[PDB]
Design a protein around this ligand. Structure first.
Ligand SMILES: CCC1=C(C)/C(=C/C2=NC(=C\c3[nH]c(/C=C4\NC(=O)[C@H](C)[C@H]4CC)c(C)c3CCC(=O)O)/C(CCC(=O)O)=C2C)NC1=O
Ligand SMILES: CCC1=C(C)/C(=C/C2=NC(=C\c3[nH]c(/C=C4\NC(=O)[C@H](C)[C@H]4CC)c(C)c3CCC(=O)O)/C(CCC(=O)O)=C2C)NC1=O
Ligand SMILES: CCC1=C(C)/C(=C/C2=NC(=C\c3[nH]c(/C=C4\NC(=O)[C@H](C)[C@H]4CC)c(C)c3CCC(=O)O)/C(CCC(=O)O)=C2C)NC1=O
Ligand SMILES: CCC1=C(C)/C(=C/C2=NC(=C\c3[nH]c(/C=C4\NC(=O)[C@H](C)[C@H]4CC)c(C)c3CCC(=O)O)/C(CCC(=O)O)=C2C)NC1=O
Ligand SMILES: CCC1=C(C)/C(=C/C2=NC(=C\c3[nH]c(/C=C4\NC(=O)[C@H](C)[C@H]4CC)c(C)c3CCC(=O)O)/C(CCC(=O)O)=C2C)NC1=O
Ligand SMILES: CCC1=C(C)/C(=C/C2=NC(=C\c3[nH]c(/C=C4\NC(=O)[C@H](C)[C@H]4CC)c(C)c3CCC(=O)O)/C(CCC(=O)O)=C2C)NC1=O
Ligand SMILES: CCC1=C(C)/C(=C/C2=NC(=C\c3[nH]c(/C=C4\NC(=O)[C@H](C)[C@H]4CC)c(C)c3CCC(=O)O)/C(CCC(=O)O)=C2C)NC1=O
Ligand SMILES: CCC1=C(C)/C(=C/C2=NC(=C\c3[nH]c(/C=C4\NC(=O)[C@H](C)[C@H]4CC)c(C)c3CCC(=O)O)/C(CCC(=O)O)=C2C)NC1=O
Ligand SMILES: CCC1=C(C)/C(=C/C2=NC(=C\c3[nH]c(/C=C4\NC(=O)[C@H](C)[C@H]4CC)c(C)c3CCC(=O)O)/C(CCC(=O)O)=C2C)NC1=O
Ligand SMILES: CCC1=C(C)/C(=C/C2=NC(=C\c3[nH]c(/C=C4\NC(=O)[C@H](C)[C@H]4CC)c(C)c3CCC(=O)O)/C(CCC(=O)O)=C2C)NC1=O
Ligand SMILES: CCC1=C(C)/C(=C/C2=NC(=C\c3[nH]c(/C=C4\NC(=O)[C@H](C)[C@H]4CC)c(C)c3CCC(=O)O)/C(CCC(=O)O)=C2C)NC1=O
Ligand SMILES: CCC1=C(C)/C(=C/C2=NC(=C\c3[nH]c(/C=C4\NC(=O)[C@H](C)[C@H]4CC)c(C)c3CCC(=O)O)/C(CCC(=O)O)=C2C)NC1=O
Ligand SMILES: CCC1=C(C)/C(=C/C2=NC(=C\c3[nH]c(/C=C4\NC(=O)[C@H](C)[C@H]4CC)c(C)c3CCC(=O)O)/C(CCC(=O)O)=C2C)NC1=O
Ligand SMILES: CCC1=C(C)/C(=C/C2=NC(=C\c3[nH]c(/C=C4\NC(=O)[C@H](C)[C@H]4CC)c(C)c3CCC(=O)O)/C(CCC(=O)O)=C2C)NC1=O
Lengths: 172, 284, 162, 51, 39, 172, 172, 162, 172
């Protein structure tokens, strides 16, 4: 597990010298932006089950071979396994949102994930269709402002669209 | 698992109940308790009548002893040390142990650090005591529940690299874990530290293609170039065994080919001409 | 997948012993049961379109709620009513599979294995299907002994639903 | 390069520097690399336009 | 079959022949001579 | 490549002893049945393009998502690739019919064939729908008694139905 | 584990349609032939230890290197392991006789069995010599009629000779 | 492994075209030929021990050298004479394999594929086997047409030896 | 390709400093020992074919399954391939004897050599039996004094027993 605080450590440790005051001022964004991190993950996990079930009707909208008989998402145990894996990405995404760096998602979600779809028979590239069909609902729920005072959280949001884009590209 | 269970040799383990040591023993269960313990802890290597651990069996039959405390005694016993510790490396032991009691393959490098320092300062007889007195044992295996195969199911805190390395551990139902062509060396010690996860290869008879194991200097898992292709749709495919003309023509079988898209179909014929059999086609 | 023949196999394989006389009588029993059952299998496939459209309307009569309110869960739109014959059309398949298999095997894996987790997500209320099957329980028109064994797998799926 | 360019050509500009790096890595076979050399325009403006 | 997957090409069996590069290359004005007549 | 004549060799070579007169009498069916093999392949390849185009209307009858926009058999190059692979099974089937043993079809048609459908994205199990929708037309063509004198060629029709059943099961 | 009853299910499930009355009449042989299955396995397992010890004198008749010093079946633990594996095929054969389809024998007896003989050093092809030296004793015990009323038991003996032939071919 | 059926396959597969009439006639010829050939197969296996011990003694008669001088190459010791029936016992196997295969296929791979490289190492002089087979060429006792085709594969292995 | 002269370079280059006079005096053994290297390789390659054919009767002495029918070294092409690989180790051994460091043998002889025996089916551990059955003949030919003046052959010789021991251990 890594952080934006500890990757800076390990970048400085492999150099092996004290951190500069130029370095810490750039890190002082994060203690200011920690006000902005801490609720965008709280926005996602509050509406976590709404994202999954709405995007379960989006991969299954476009590719109706999955509930076709003989499909790979066909039977009830297989379809319950789809929902078992439809939000196993969202916890690993929201871990990387809170940590701020994707080294948690890359050794627990994507490390060898592509290998099993070549082993089981389930289509790898179809999961990459539905995963970035989550992010338009994930950004679209996180972007809108209700109650919370307006702020420029767009820069942080790009990060959120980057983590779904990383996880979708390394599956298919 | 449906339609991967018949190929990967996992349909006996998929619908297999647990032993469930009802606390008041009858004779009908306890010998079937002891048999199912010897099949997983010893890894399908057969017990002889002399090497039955007859003293240990009596204790298991008795009510006071648990399944948890009986599987410590067979692993402490020199029978388990005879097949396994006698002909194994230290990192060979940790992947075997984590197979024999927890039922998976080690997913990170941090647990191999944390077991080798405890092996030296305290010993192996307490090293097996660390695995049994662990929280990941106690959450799924009770004191009356035998160990069984935990790599396939989701197992709430799992890695997807760990699902690839469990098929690396055993080659199906027949395998007896010294029954493996890669013999005395260790398998996961290379792919633990370099943190790349190799191809799941099935056990054979169902799978035609088995010869490929992860080579010492394999090509990269993803390629960065366009691989001299008009269209950027690279494919990476792996071969079992090539019986072409000899020594100059094929210096190395089981090698992999990073191949662009418009010539994938012309090469699959070329591998089948040489005798090679395709193992895994990943995109890149 | 479960079968009284394959229960005689896996119980014989975990013991590590041969097929004694105490597993052959398990398969002996299934054959007697099987002959009666296939008569229930022919009774259902001949009435395929009759039972499905009879039971689908039998849901809407007791439940006028699902035909009226808009939503992706219910069947106000035709695509809901098109997926109505998807589900109950798939329900009668596995019931006909479980009769020819002689056991609850294919009904275990294909239908009721993950059924408690889908219905919590998609808002499919299990009281809809549990009374869809009760119409199939009454209106299959079977008689004799096969009317009992076809009645057995129906209210096995009921207890999995409720 | 020698088989393809006959020694004199190597130059600086003619060599695709990227292909050489890939070959060391092993991403592309040598047979894939001579294809990328022959399907280069530094080959094409050299051989094909004159011949 | 002959060069395999991973060998650079080479002239094969050139025992009684000229090296290909040297033997074969890639290749295949009346006003000037009157201008030198002017000089 | 193997045969019914050379698998008997390799079965006897791994024993390493002369072939018995009990063994050769069973092989003497094949020199009698070679009269019956040699035209059932000639019946298939005569009507090869009729089988493919009629079964192109059978997978596309039942599953109309394939010419749906966004489908996997959708575009013209993709649909020309479907016909490119609709009879690449028939030559490997008719090779196994002439050879009599399926070791040609298992190292050239089915060896790693399932792996590409997990790589490309094309549905593996849908090809297994249309392949045994060829065999009812393939056996049907073989079955008619018109022309040649009636003979019991039905015995190896169970072989021909076995090779399509093997090739369909090892795809999906 | 599969059956002749449940492979018909899974063949029909991958089609996804009701079973025809043409299909069930062919299955009605099996409820009639279940009278004939149920005692041919009872004939084998009654004389199971007689088959093993008589065929232990047949591989060891023809290949006397196995009790030669330095042989692979040489020592007492090794020779006790030979008998440990001489009837581990017979239970998996008689499982497939009762089930009627060889999907039990193919994931428990032959799935990766060839791989260990390339690992241990024990000769793979020698086991294939002695396994079809069991079937001439297995068929020869199952076919002869003493006491039991005459019946056409020949029809599934070709099944029983097929299962030994499958298991011997996939070892060596 | 080569076979006139599998020559009709691989020539059809590299062209990428179907099995036309010009490959089916290739398998036609082998079938007609096979009936004549099998009769040569039964002629050799019935005379297995007669031909081997006849030809093994036929080597020692023309070559009294290999029975006398000590060495691991020759057969002065009984283990040489035990390995004498190994080789010529293995020679008549593949000749009987090549007749039932209908081609020179199994004789190509099993016998003559690396035969020129072993005999340069182990000092097995190929004139020993080439006149061992000449005794099998004369003393097989076959007649008719099968006597010619069994004579064909014998002097195909001769030209591979010399 | 490396040397004892160029590994000292690359050890000093990764330090990046001039070679000490303590370092060069230890290297001055090698210009004295180059008198002793240069004939021990000349002793091996003079009797190269005698070592191979005598050790071909040593693996085949102890393990007679290899010319057993069905064995892996059984047929003539397979047995010619055994001799093709029985001295492909000796040239790579004698390369390492002349170079003095085993980086030639480790990227040309042993780099991925174990992988093919898991691919082909040929037993890996059996080659490790016969390879150190060469070194007792290799050392035994290289050590005996005939003609050549007395010298300290043994110190260099331990090296020769180490290279066979390295190559045998990394096969099986
Ligand atoms: C760990 C528990 C915890 C949470 C959840 C938390 C959130 C949090 N978000 C805040 C502000 C804010 N949060 C946002 C977030 C956004 N506005 C948008 O329009 C965007 C779509 C979105 C980002 C994608 C904004 C714009 C502010 C304005 C104030 C600030 O800059 O902090 C503040 C400032 C103080 C306050 O609101 O009282 C709090 C408390 N603080 C906590 O202690
Ligand atoms: C007069 C001759 C005679 C003897 C000796 C005898 C022994 C005997 N020992 C028994 C059990 C037992 N005996 C032991 C003994 C031991 N456990 C260990 O680990 C130690 C090595 C050892 C004690 C020194 C145990 C544990 C059991 C019960 C095991 C169980 O029920 O699971 C039983 C089972 C039922 C019962 O005891 O009533 C008998 C009959 N019976 C006889 O007629
Ligand atoms: C019983 C046979 C056996 C051995 C020898 C063995 C070694 C071994 N050495 C390790 C690490 C290591 N070993 C060293 C050793 C050294 N660093 C130097 O500069 C020196 C040259 C050298 C000490 C003399 C270092 C630094 C690491 C950790 C490197 C890292 O983690 O970054 C690890 C990684 C995880 C762990 O230790 O638990 C293993 C398994 N394992 C075995 O089973
Ligand atoms: C195109 C849309 C789509 C998706 C995504 C999909 C997933 C899917 N995942 C499956 C299994 C699985 N998926 C996982 C995934 C994971 N395990 C972990 O711990 C991690 C969090 C995670 C990887 C990142 C595992 C372990 C299984 C098998 C579990 C078991 O069989 O016990 C199965 C069961 C059978 C099969 O794979 O063939 C399906 C159908 N199917 C679809 O049609
Ligand atoms: C310098 C590094 C290096 C090595 C070592 C090497 C070995 C090597 N041995 C091979 C084959 C082979 N190697 C053997 C060896 C043996 N079989 C037995 O039963 C015997 C015990 C044993 C000899 C003692 C055999 C039999 C084959 C042929 C396998 C086949 O045809 O399927 C092959 C591929 C097949 C071929 O072209 O012949 C390679 C690459 N190639 C290399 O580049
Ligand atoms: C901190 C400053 C710094 C940099 C950047 C650096 C780069 C560097 N890149 C290398 C190789 C390489 N670098 C690449 C890179 C690429 N290939 C492509 O086609 C792409 C355009 C590109 C990746 C984006 C490749 C392929 C090699 C190896 C080529 C070969 O070995 O054949 C090597 C050779 C040995 C080694 O890596 O250990 C070094 C030292 N070294 C440094 O000290
Ligand atoms: C996205 C670009 C695209 C196009 C345009 C396309 C056309 C296309 N039209 C087809 C058939 C057809 N095309 C037509 C159209 C016509 N026939 C007539 O009689 C009329 C003269 C004419 C229309 C004006 C008909 C009627 C069929 C069905 C013919 C059959 O089923 O045999 C087929 C083969 C079967 C199919 O999937 O439906 C393709 C691939 N495919 C493509 O991917
Ligand atoms: C001789 C053994 C052999 C086979 C069979 C083979 C198939 C093969 N099929 C391919 C593509 C394909 N194959 C299909 C097939 C289908 N689409 C559907 O929906 C239907 C179910 C099915 C037709 C019946 C499609 C659509 C593609 C291209 C998919 C894409 O590129 O997006 C490709 C990709 C590149 C290329 O074709 O050149 C290969 C290599 N290769 C071989 O060497
Ligand atoms: C409708 C089901 C059916 C089939 C398939 C059938 C075929 C069939 N082909 C036959 C003969 C034959 N068939 C062929 C065919 C050929 N030989 C060649 O070498 C050519 C390449 C090829 C033609 C292109 C020949 C040569 C014969 C010889 C006997 C005869 O003239 O009928 C016979 C004669 C009787 C017998 O073989 O028992 C049968 C039965 N009979 C049937 O009832
Ligand atoms: C290296 C240590 C070692 C020993 C000693 C050993 C003995 C041994 N003797 C056997 C059979 C036998 N043992 C005997 C010996 C005897 N039977 C008699 O009638 C006499 C009383 C007695 C000799 C004094 C005979 C005659 C057979 C053959 C019995 C049979 O084939 O059923 C067998 C089973 C079949 C076999 O491979 O030949 C073994 C394993 N095995 C071992 O690995
Ligand atoms: C029921 C499913 C099943 C099977 C089939 C099975 C077979 C099996 N046979 C084994 C060993 C063995 N198998 C044999 C068999 C033989 N060796 C010969 O030379 C003879 C010809 C032959 C007996 C006739 C031998 C000798 C061993 C031990 C090899 C050794 O210890 O080196 C092993 C390795 C583990 C061990 O030996 O303890 C397994 C797993 N295990 C299973 O769970
Ligand atoms: C030698 C070759 C051969 C065999 C194998 C054979 C078996 C055989 N078993 C039969 C009957 C039967 N076999 C059984 C056997 C059993 N039922 C059970 O439920 C028990 C578990 C089991 C005994 C343990 C039964 C109950 C019958 C009923 C008919 C009868 O009494 O014969 C019959 C009566 C005629 C028929 O079935 O067509 C046959 C043919 N007949 C032959 O010619
Ligand atoms: C399956 C086809 C096949 C054949 C035929 C075959 C022959 C063959 N015979 C050999 C040796 C031998 N061959 C012979 C045979 C003879 N030497 C004589 O003196 C007699 C003249 C002559 C017999 C008539 C002898 C005595 C040896 C042992 C020579 C030695 O060990 O140096 C060897 C080398 C060592 C061996 O494994 O035993 C081979 C490979 N190998 C094959 O794979
Ligand atoms: C049996 C163990 C043993 C060995 C191996 C041995 C070798 C050996 N070779 C020597 C010399 C030598 N050896 C060679 C050999 C050669 N120089 C070349 O350039 C040629 C390529 C090559 C011959 C082909 C030469 C040139 C000398 C010079 C000294 C002399 O004439 O002995 C000497 C002289 C004394 C010494 O070096 O200390 C020794 C010891 N002495 C032993 O006791």
């Amino acid at each position: 597990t890594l952080d934006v605080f500890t990757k800076v450590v390990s970048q400085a440790d492999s150099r092996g010298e004290f951190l500069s005051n130029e370095q810490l001022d750039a890190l002082a964004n994060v203690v200011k932006e920690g006000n902005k991190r801490l609720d965008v993950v709280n926005r996602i996990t509050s509406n976590a089950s709404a994202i999954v079930t709405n995007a379960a009707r989006a991969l299954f909208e476009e590719q109706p071979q999955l509930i076709a008989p003989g499909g790979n998402a066909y039977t009830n145990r297989r379809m319950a396994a789809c929902l078992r894996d439809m939000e196993i990405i969202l916890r690993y995404v929201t871990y990387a949102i809170l940590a701020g760096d994707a080294s948690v998602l890359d050794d627990r979600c994507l490390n060898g994930l592509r290998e099993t779809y070549q082993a089981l028979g389930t289509p790898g590239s179809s999961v990459a269709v539905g995963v970035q069909k989550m992010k338009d609902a994930a950004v679209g729920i996180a972007n809108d402002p209700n109650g919370i005072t307006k702020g420029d959280c767009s820069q942080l949001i790009s990060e959120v669209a980057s983590y779904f884009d990383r996880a979708a590209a390394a599956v298919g | 698992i449906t339609t991967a269970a018949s190929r990967l040799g996992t349909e006996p383990f998929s619908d297999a109940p647990k032993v469930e040591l009802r606390p008041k023993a009858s004779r009908e269960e306890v010998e079937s308790v002891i048999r199912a313990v010897y099949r997983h802890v010893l890894g399908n290597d057969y017990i002889l009548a002399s090497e039955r651990l007859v003293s240990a069996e009596s204790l298991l039959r008795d009510g006071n002893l648990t399944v948890r405390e009986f599987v410590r005694s067979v692993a402490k016993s020199e029978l388990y040390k005879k097949k396994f510790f006698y002909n194994s490396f230290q990192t060979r032991l940790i992947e075997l142990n984590y197979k024999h009691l927890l039922g998976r393959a080690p997913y990170d490098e941090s647990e191999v650090v944390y077991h080798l320092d405890l092996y030296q300062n305290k010993g192996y007889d307490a090293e097996i005591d660390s695995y049994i007195d662990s929280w990941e044992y106690q959450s799924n295996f009770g004191d009356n529940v035998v160990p069984y195969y935990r790599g396939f199911e989701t197992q709430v805190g799992q890695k997807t690299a760990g699902f690839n390395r469990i098929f690396r551990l055993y080659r199906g139902y027949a395998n007896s874990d010294r029954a493996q062509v890669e013999g005395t060396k260790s398998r996961l010690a290379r792919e633990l530290a370099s943190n790349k996860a190799s191809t799941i290869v099935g056990p054979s008879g169902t799978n035609d293609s088995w010869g490929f194991r992860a080579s010492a200097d394999v090509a990269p898992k993803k390629n960065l170039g366009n691989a001299v292709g008009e269209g950027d749709r690279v494919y990476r495919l792996e071969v079992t065994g090539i019986r072409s003309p000899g020594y100059p023509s094929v210096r190395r079988s089981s090698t992999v080919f990073i191949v662009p898209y418009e010539r994938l179909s012309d090469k699959i014929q070329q591998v089948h001409k040489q005798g090679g059999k395709i193992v895994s086609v990943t995109s890149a | 997948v479960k079968t009284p023949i394959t229960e005689a196999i896996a119980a014989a394989d975990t013991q590590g012993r041969f097929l004694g006389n105490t597993e052959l009588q398990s398969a002996r029993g299934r054959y007697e049961r099987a002959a009666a059952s296939l008569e229930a299998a022919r009774g259902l496939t001949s009435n395929a379109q009759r039972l499905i459209d009879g039971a689908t309307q039998a849901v809407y009569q007791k439940f006028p709620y699902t035909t009226q309110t808009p939503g992706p869960q219910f069947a106000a739109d035709s695509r809901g009513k098109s997926k109505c014959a998807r589900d109950v059309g798939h329900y009668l398949r596995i019931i006909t599979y479980s009769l020819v298999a002689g056991g609850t095997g294919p009904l275990d894996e294909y239908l009721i294995a993950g059924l408690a987790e889908i219905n919590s997500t998609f808002d499919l209320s299990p009281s809809w299907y549990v009374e869809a099957l009760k119409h199939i329980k009454a209106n299959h028109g079977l008689s004799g002994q096969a009317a009992n064994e076809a009645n057995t797998y129906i209210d096995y799926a009921i207890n999995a639903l409720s | 390069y020698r088989q393809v360019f006959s020694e004199h050509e190597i130059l600086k500009f003619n060599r695709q520097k990227t292909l050489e790096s890939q070959v060391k890595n092993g991403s592309i076979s040598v047979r894939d690399f001579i294809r990328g050399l022959a399907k280069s325009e530094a080959f094409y403006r050299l051989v094909v336009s004159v011949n | 079959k002959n060069f395999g997957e991973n060998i650079v090409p080479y002239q094969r069996k050139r025992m009684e022949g000229r090296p290909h590069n040297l033997v074969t290359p890639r290749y295949g004005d009346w006003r000037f001579t009157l201008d030198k007549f002017y000089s």
